[PDB]
Nucleic acid binder design. Structure first.
Ligand SMILES: *P(=O)(O)OC[C@H]1O[C@@H](n2cnc3c(=O)[nH]c(N)nc32)[C@H](O)[C@@H]1O
Ligand SMILES: [Zn+2]
Ligand SMILES: [Zn+2]
Ligand SMILES: [Zn+2]
Lengths: 771, 286, 150, 278, 285
RNA sequence: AAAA
RNA sequence: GCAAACCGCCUCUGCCCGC
RNA sequence: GUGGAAAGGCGGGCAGAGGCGGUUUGC
């Protein structure tokens, strides 16, 4: 079929680039990809690899000269055996050629992939495994031919055992082409997988648009609106996942974050199948926000207007104006994908669509038509957990305590929360099947457990790129998730009470919520869709894959010495609620939530090139604090760290004067310098103080009482000699020698005194002793 | 236009900032206490035709706050064209998250001018913990409870438009009754109590076809730009069903809203306040 | 050196704790400061860090030697004093009229500073101008424990 | 129905130092204003202490008050904590969570109770609303000016725990308001029925007079209460006041009178003009 | 179960400091008398807390009940659950020894239940706590300030406290170690307030006589202080027992029975004829 | 809500 | 003829249990 | 015709245990 042939032609068009950086054959990599695919058609492969070598030998406009050698070479092969029309095969070659120029707009060296965050730094080649190795950009711009040779051998082995389909090839190509540069140039920051993936996306969107070979020969697909950028966003997530009472356990939350993502995958996989697209047409899908390149046909605009209509009406019946999916699309052209002259047309069409998302979000449920219409229904009640309104009788008893009458969509997520340690993924099947726990707007999802057989046309498999036990007629869709949890004596997820028991000194539950700063400005600097793809996967893969290996105690030669209260355990009592896109929400024992906030930041500082920052809000809570309470404090603390300044952490609650010149949150390098000077002279390790300070909390708490005189009047100088008298009487005059005199340089800079910033170091040490 | 501004100088903490449907339910309960049943039905007819009250908004020392219109977020790139781009992004972010504006910046945001947000909010939301004690054994049972604590010279106010004899016969006797009893929440703990003062507010509004609502709306037709508000209260022990209102600051066009009567199984009919409080606004091309 | 460490407003309380804890180096700059404290006969003219400036340079001088307070504390409780400032100047004269031996010089320097500020307190109100003095008198004893004295 | 609002004003004197905790630099803090940092007496802490003192008062006189107050014949003295069944024959019938409180379960029953008529009832399907409002008591203007002038309004009192054999000391700290402080209270009674308002004002003043010999908040058994009521004025605020606003309400002046003298003597004598307009 | 009310027996009088009294304390303080005494923050004068008096009366009464766990058990049940001693050598909370709670590291007899503390002579008078039950106290001991004639001696200029210098002398080299102790002057006189809350008319003789037993033990022992060095020597000077019945609160009239012992001793009330002083209390019950 |  | 040397605190404990 | 009605942040807890204003010799 020409549908599978145009997509797999553009996906494998750049094949042989990694055999020319290796050097198995003679030069001019278009010759080698013809030979690498001819040999691949010989052993452990079908005969369609023989005809896919036509796509790797007639591109870049170097051998496809004068329209005569393309006819003879295709004539030698049998199109009829494949069943593809002889003319129709030729039509596909031109489409693949055009989509290569629309995806890059761009030698002779084995030069590595450079980082999208620092274009001056480069990645060494690794696999995409997320296990024991962190891809950190370094100044080593050299690649050994043997390393490339090893990659080709692994790639040859996996392409021979892999079915010839777009879904099967895409995880094979992603495993080895993620850290390979596409075009060899200084400061090339586009992955080879992303370029190949975006080329199968555009070539299949051109085929659905109906443009033929002479439309490319005359340049008609270019400078005419034939493409269509789809973009969606879920709105109201904080009020959807975290608006739950004290009847919601940690397992219920961790199932709410898994259920929002299955709503998101149900909409994205509906668009691809109903328009004829593959999974390569998805540019990114990260954080309840996706982007798809499709075709601009009247059949597709009619067909996307039903996916938007049905999914919003499904969300309004289920969740009464708590979660909304705004889907918009903007018609673009071939010249709009790239930078034309000196003007960025891809960042302008993206922000022509981002304004359409903005007005859609202010017309929040306008596609309902019974939205502002009143209808009298008797005997309505509320769920004790999430607090939705249902007619009573639809309420059913909860499995924890059958006295309470919860709504039925919360018992599907208590029962899902017990399966998430046992779960290998999901299967996308029809609404009315056996085994379906939860429904989306278009489908139902059967859990695929450890020992079992998956059922459905699409199988969503989590945290791997290898289709092991999967039927060969089903579609493989990989998805990644940050799924670290502290396991109990059973094989389940620990509770809030079980994590807080493990905390050092005072028993409190630590909650952190942090995200990347000014990320949306960084994505506007991308001028091509193969560059937006690379900047979005690497940013997503940090929070999907590499934030769970920071918790495993790795990467310590990069992280080094962070502010810690105890030594880092082998199994940390950390539960990740969510981590993906540019944000993360993590609960645990308060000693390790404190340490991991400086441990994630130090590794994110080196995962990027030092060019992107974080802001993290920290909170320390009682066990019986409801999670709608625990998520509204730490979100308030994240926004206080963000509005004040970027790249600063909110360590602990503090009292500060109302002059507008004091602020509650610490810069990362500021607090991590205050821990190097104030903590080793008062704190010994693992919950105990130093010598000559044991049982001297009559020094440390009173030092915070002298600090409260500074908070009442910052210009009164009483606090200065009360510290020197308190230090002097106890004989500890050498501990803290700069809190006794006023800093005259801080008065001229209009910055606070050193007694103001000692609060967030002492308080943490006073909670690590039993408080 | 010219409005009567009914200030509420608090004598404690509030439960929530009042809305126009719980202000009309408080007034209709106040009129039934001091006049009778047939004056509430005369009250609803006064509101249905002509004059309607708005929602309650904070003030802090002669600076009367008003909700930000929703007309600015589609325009908010064009409002800030005269700025350096690296500080134009964090000025834009806090201009979109902001909920209230001054009386000076509300009149500029109605005309798509460059405007500024207030820095400090006149109130705070605390969680004060109460407890239940057994009368023999003193066994404690902590629950939590949230309030609105106002500053030294701050408080809340709403606006009135209409004829004067409806104000001076119904609204002005109601707020003197409703000062000693409460507006919402645990008023037996002394929460919703206040002292009342009547003042005069003038608002510059451009003459246009579109208008922002300063109250909850309950629209008869679909509005232009909106934000969904989903509340349903309580009436003499009977739970009200939740209704889809429209938050303050949303844009309608020739839409009067309307009060909806409920049944609820009482001796009388219960009205939910759903009238609009239009002030003219200027829109972009969408 | 000694005048470079004990500068105008607040230079080094931790640097003055190295020299004082050496003999005659502080005995000139602080004697100039005690003369400046004698030039600070007007007590309520220093609302700046000058009270904290002088009391470090007072206590850095008295650290080189050995070195009423509860009467100052009880008259501080009377705020919530002309009859007792006579007795307070009497008990301060009683101490320098008693201390003979190696501690005459520390007590005479302690006599040199307070009685110029105890003359203004005679002809002045009592809520103000004594609160500004009793903040200074606490600050002298506070740093004197810090430098290693008692 | 509505007839008026009897308004009680005066001052709360903390004769011994007062504690009402928050459990959030002193280790146990008294609760304070979020904006100005001043302590206050909650309206719930004063209301629930007046109810608790009066529910024990009515529990002792269940047999003697069967005829003045009906639906005290539906209760037997005691608590429902032993037999874990709500609204049984005992007097403390409702378990809110872990504590047992007398709350009558119906409108027609709580209308004849002495406690739930004055203080309110929950019930199923019924919901009798209370008749009194107990405001938050904030500091007087004389004690706000002492706070501006540098005085301290809360201390930190250190207690200890001592072994009876070895005498090891185990000390803790409690913030408590300085003894002698003045708060400004306010109680608004809602005259719904013109027949029984004399009993409701007298039953309220009885709980005030039990409170002056008991304690408020705090530890109290170690001397953290010792509260004292100093009355100022008793306004009546009739129904004609709320209609027109012309200030001709009834004012009963008790500038220096105790709670025992007020209830003991007076009321008919003080409340003579109040009983005239009913 | 069934907490009632009958009245509030009020014990007023004076606390005579026959010997110097030191109740210690421990912040914007630079030069003062070391080891100070507790003082009212508003009036400046010292006082005796209700915590330091009720805890000192409970401690002297627990040790008296611990001495006789076979002579009080026939009148007080649930004392058969206790063996004389402490729970210190085996660190379990509730075992068969008498002092059965860990405060932080010390051991104090506090009964663990409502039905246990209802029949104990210590915890039905002083109260208890625990996992559930929480039997609350029946006496309330208030903070004792100066009398109004020692308020005025302070106005006249006399000293209400003093400073006593004591020296810990090394036994080998005769080398000193001086320190100053503030102590309220001997002869000073504090006005106290002890209210007993009559909850059961059956046993109120037994709680008043046990409260007067604890007072009689305190006049032989010391209050506060370092009393083995002669710092306590307290003495109770009673002004009036009063009864305050339940009908006092409703009526507001002087219906309270006044026992007159203005010139009697703490061991003279508990002395033979106690029945004669508290006879009119039985006429109102 | 800086794409949760 | 009358004093002058040092010693000016030492060392333990410092929030629990429940909701 | 009020997201309302009902609800004490408190039960129990000594700032306490040991300590001679004292010794030695001269200027
Ligand atoms: P209990 O059996 O815990 O009843 C549950 C009920 O009480 C609250 N609760 C109990 N203990 C605590 C605590 O220490 N802290 C907080 N914040 N809440 C507590 C639960 O929240 C629940 O409402
Ligand atoms: Zn639910
Ligand atoms: Zn009742
Ligand atoms: Zn006992």
């Amino acid at each position: 079929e020409i549908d599978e042939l145009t997509a797999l032609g553009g996906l494998l068009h750049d094949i042989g680039k990694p055999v020319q950086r290796a050097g198995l054959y003679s030069g001019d990599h278009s010759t080698q990809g013809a030979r690498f695919l001819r040999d691949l058609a010989e052993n452990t492969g079908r005969a369609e690899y023989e005809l896919l070598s036509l796509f790797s030998e007639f591109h870049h406009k170097g051998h496809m000269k004068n329209d005569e050698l393309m006819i003879r070479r295709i004539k030698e092969l049998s199109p009829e055996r494949f069943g593809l029309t002889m003319e129709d095969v030729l039509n596909a070659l031109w489409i693949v050629y055009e989509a290569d120029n629309l995806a890059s707009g761009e030698p002779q060296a084995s030069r590595p992939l450079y980082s999208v965050f620092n274009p001056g730094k480069a990645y060494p080649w690794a696999e995409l495994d997320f296990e024991k190795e962190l891809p950190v950009p370094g100044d080593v711009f050299s690649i050994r031919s043997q390393d490339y040779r090893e990659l080709v051998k692994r790639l040859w082995e996996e392409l021979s055992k892999a079915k010839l389909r777009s879904d099967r090839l895409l995880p094979v190509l992603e495993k080895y082409l993620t850290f390979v540069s596409s075009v060899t140039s200084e400061g090339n920051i586009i992955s080879l997988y992303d370029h190949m993936r975006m080329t199968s996306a555009i070539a299949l969107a051109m085929l659905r648009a109906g443009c033929t070979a002479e439309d490319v020969r005359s340049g008609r697909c270019r400078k005419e609106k034939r493409f269509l950028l789809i973009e969606g966003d879920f709105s109201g997530i904080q009020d959807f996942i975290y608006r739950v009472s004290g009847k919601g356990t940690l397992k219920y939350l961790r199932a709410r974050s898994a259920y929002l993502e299955l709503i998101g995958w149900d909409v994205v996989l509906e668009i691809l199948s109903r328009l004829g697209l593959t999974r390569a047409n998805v540019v990114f899908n990260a954080g309840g926000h996706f982007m798809i390149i499709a075709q601009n046909t009247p059949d597709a605009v009619k067909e996307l207007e039903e996916i938007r209509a049905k999914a919003v009406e499904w969300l309004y019946r289920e969740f009464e104006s708590d979660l909304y999916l705004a889907i918009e699309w903007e018609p673009v052209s071939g010249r709009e994908f790239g930078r034309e002259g000196g003007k960025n047309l891809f960042a302008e069409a993206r922000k022509r669509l981002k304004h359409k998302l903005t007005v859609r979000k202010l017309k929040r449920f306008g596609e309902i038509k019974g939205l502002f219409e009143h209808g009298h229904t008797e005997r309505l009640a509320e769920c004790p957990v999430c607090g939705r309104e249902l007619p009573e009788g639809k309420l059913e008893p909860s499995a924890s305590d059958p006295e309470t009458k919860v709504c039925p969509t919360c018992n599907r997520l208590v029962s899902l929360g017990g399966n998430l340690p046992k779960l290998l993924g999901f299967g996308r099947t029809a609404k009315n099947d056996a085994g379906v726990l939860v429904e989306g707007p278009f489908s139902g999802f059967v859990p695929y457990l450890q020992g079992g057989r998956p059922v459905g046309e699409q199988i969503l498999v989590k945290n791997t790129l290898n289709p092991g036990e999967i039927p060969e007629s089903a579609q493989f869709v990989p998805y990644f998730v940050a799924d670290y949890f502290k396991k109990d004596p059973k094989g389940g997820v620990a509770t809030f009470e079980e994590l807080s028991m493990a905390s050092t000194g005072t028993r409190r539950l630590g909650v952190m919520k942090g995200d990347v700063d000014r990320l949306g400005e960084f994505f506007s600097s991308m001028d091509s869709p193969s560059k937006l793809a690379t900047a979005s996967r690497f940013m997503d893969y940090f929070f999907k894959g590499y934030i769970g290996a920071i918790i495993e105690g790795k990467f310590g030669y990069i992280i080094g010495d962070v502010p810690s209260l105890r030594d880092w355990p082998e199994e940390p009592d950390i539960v990740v609620v969510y981590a993906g896109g540019d944000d993360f929400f993590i609960v645990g024992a308060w000693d390790q939530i404190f340490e991991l906030a400086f441990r994630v930041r130090r590794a994110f500082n080196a995962y990027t090139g030092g060019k992107l920052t974080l802001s993290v809000g920290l909170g320390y809570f009682d066990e019986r604090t409801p999670i709608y309470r625990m998520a509204d404090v730490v979100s308030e603390r994240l926004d206080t760290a963000k509005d004040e300044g970027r790249n600063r952490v909110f360590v602990v609650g503090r009292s500060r004067p109302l002059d507008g010149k004091h602020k509650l949150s610490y810069e990362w390098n500021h607090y991590e310098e205050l821990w190097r000077t104030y903590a080793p002279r008062i704190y010994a390790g693992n919950g105990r103080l130093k010598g000559k300070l044991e049982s001297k909390k009559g020094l440390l708490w009173k030092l915070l009482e002298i600090r409260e005189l500074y908070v009442r009047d910052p210009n009164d100088v009483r606090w200065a000699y009360l510290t020197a008298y308190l230090l002097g009487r106890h004989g500890l005059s050498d501990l803290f020698p700069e809190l006794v005199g006023i800093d005259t340089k801080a008065v001229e800079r209009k910055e606070p005194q050193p007694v103001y910033w000692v609060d967030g170091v002492l308080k943490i040490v006073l909670m690590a002793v039993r408080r | 236009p010219k409005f009567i501004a009914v200030k509420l100088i608090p004598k404690g903490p509030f439960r929530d900032i009042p809305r126009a449907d719980t202000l009309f339910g408080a007034i209709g309960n106040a009129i039934s206490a001091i006049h009778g049943q047939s004056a509430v039905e005369e009250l609803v007819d006064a509101f249905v035709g002509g004059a309607r009250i708005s929602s309650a908004f904070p003030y802090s020392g002669d600076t009367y706050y008003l909700p930000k219109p929703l007309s600015v977020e589609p325009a908010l790139e064009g409002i800030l064209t005269g700025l350096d781009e690296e500080e134009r992004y964090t000025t834009a972010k806090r201009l979109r998250k902001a909920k209230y504006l001054d009386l000076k910046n509300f009149e500029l945001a109605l005309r798509l001018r460059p405007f500024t947000i207030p820095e400090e909010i006149p109130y705070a939301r605390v969680d004060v913990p109460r407890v239940v004690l057994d009368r023999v054994t003193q066994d404690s049972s902590i629950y939590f409870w949230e309030e609105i604590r106002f500053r030294e010279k701050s408080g809340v106010y709403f606006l009135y438009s209409g004829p004067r004899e409806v104000f001076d016969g119904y609204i002005a006797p109601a707020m003197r009754f409703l000062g000693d009893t409460g507006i919402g929440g645990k008023s037996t703990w002394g929460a919703g109590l206040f002292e009342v003062e009547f003042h005069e507010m003038k608002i510059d509004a451009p003459g246009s076809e579109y208008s922002v609502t300063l109250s909850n709306a309950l629209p008869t037709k679909t509005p232009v730009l909106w934000r969904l508000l989903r509340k349903g209260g309580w009436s003499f022990g009977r739970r009200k069903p939740r209704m889809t209102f429209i938050a303050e600051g949303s844009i309608v066009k020739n839409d009067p809203g309307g009060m909806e009567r409920l049944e609820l199984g009482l001796s009388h009919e219960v009205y939910v306040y759903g009238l609009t409080f239009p002030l003219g606004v200027e829109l972009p091309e969408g | 050196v000694d005048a470079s460490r004990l500068f105008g407003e607040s230079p080094d309380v931790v640097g003055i704790k190295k020299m004082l804890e050496k003999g005659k180096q502080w005995e000139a700059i602080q004697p100039y400061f005690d003369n400046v404290v004698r030039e600070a006969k007007n007590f309520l003219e220093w609302s700046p860090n000058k009270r904290l400036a002088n009391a470090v340079t007072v206590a850095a001088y008295l650290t080189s030697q050995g070195l009423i307070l509860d009467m100052a504390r009880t008259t501080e409780l009377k705020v919530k004093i002309k009859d007792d400032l006579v007795k307070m100047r009497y008990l301060l004269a009683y101490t320098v009229g008693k201390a003979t031996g190696q501690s005459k010089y520390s007590l005479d320097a302690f006599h040199r500073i307070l009685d110029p500020m105890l003359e203004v307190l005679m002809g002045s109100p009592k809520k103000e101008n004594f609160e500004k003095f009793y903040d200074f008198l606490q600050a002298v004893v506070a740093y004197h424990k810090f430098f290693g004295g008692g | 129905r509505f007839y008026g609002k009897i308004v009680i004003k005066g001052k709360i004197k903390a004769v011994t130092g007062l504690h009402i905790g928050s459990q959030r630099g002193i280790a146990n803090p008294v609760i304070k204003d979020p904006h100005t940092g001043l302590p206050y007496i909650p309206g719930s802490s004063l209301k629930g202490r007046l109810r608790s003192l009066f529910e024990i008062l009515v529990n002792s006189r269940l047999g003697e008050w069967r005829e003045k107050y009906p639906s005290l014949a539906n209760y037997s003295p005691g608590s429902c904590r032993p037999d874990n069944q709500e609204n049984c024959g005992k007097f403390f019938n409702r378990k809110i969570n872990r504590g047992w409180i007398h709350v009558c379960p119906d409108y027609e029953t709580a209308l004849a109770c002495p406690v739930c008529r004055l203080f309110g009832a929950s019930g199923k399907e019924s919901n009798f609303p209370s008749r009194i409002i107990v405001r938050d008591a904030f500091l007087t203007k004389e004690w706000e000016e002492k706070w501006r002038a540098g005085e301290a309004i809360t201390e930190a009192k250190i207690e200890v725990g001592i072994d009876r054999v070895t005498s090891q000391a185990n000390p803790r700290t409690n913030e408590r308001v300085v003894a002698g402080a003045e708060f400004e209270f306010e109680i608004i009674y809602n005259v719904e029925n013109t027949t029984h308002w004399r009993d409701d004002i007298k039953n309220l003043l009885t709980a005030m007079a039990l409170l002056e010999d008991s304690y408020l908040g705090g530890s109290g058994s170690r001397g953290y209460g010792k509260v004292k009521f100093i009355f100022d004025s008793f306004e009546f605020r009739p129904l004609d006041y709320y209609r027109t606003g012309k200030d001709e309400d009834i004012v009963s002046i008790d500038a220096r009178e105790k709670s025992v003298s007020d209830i003991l003597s007076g009321f008919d004598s003080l409340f003579s003009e109040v009983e005239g307009k009913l």
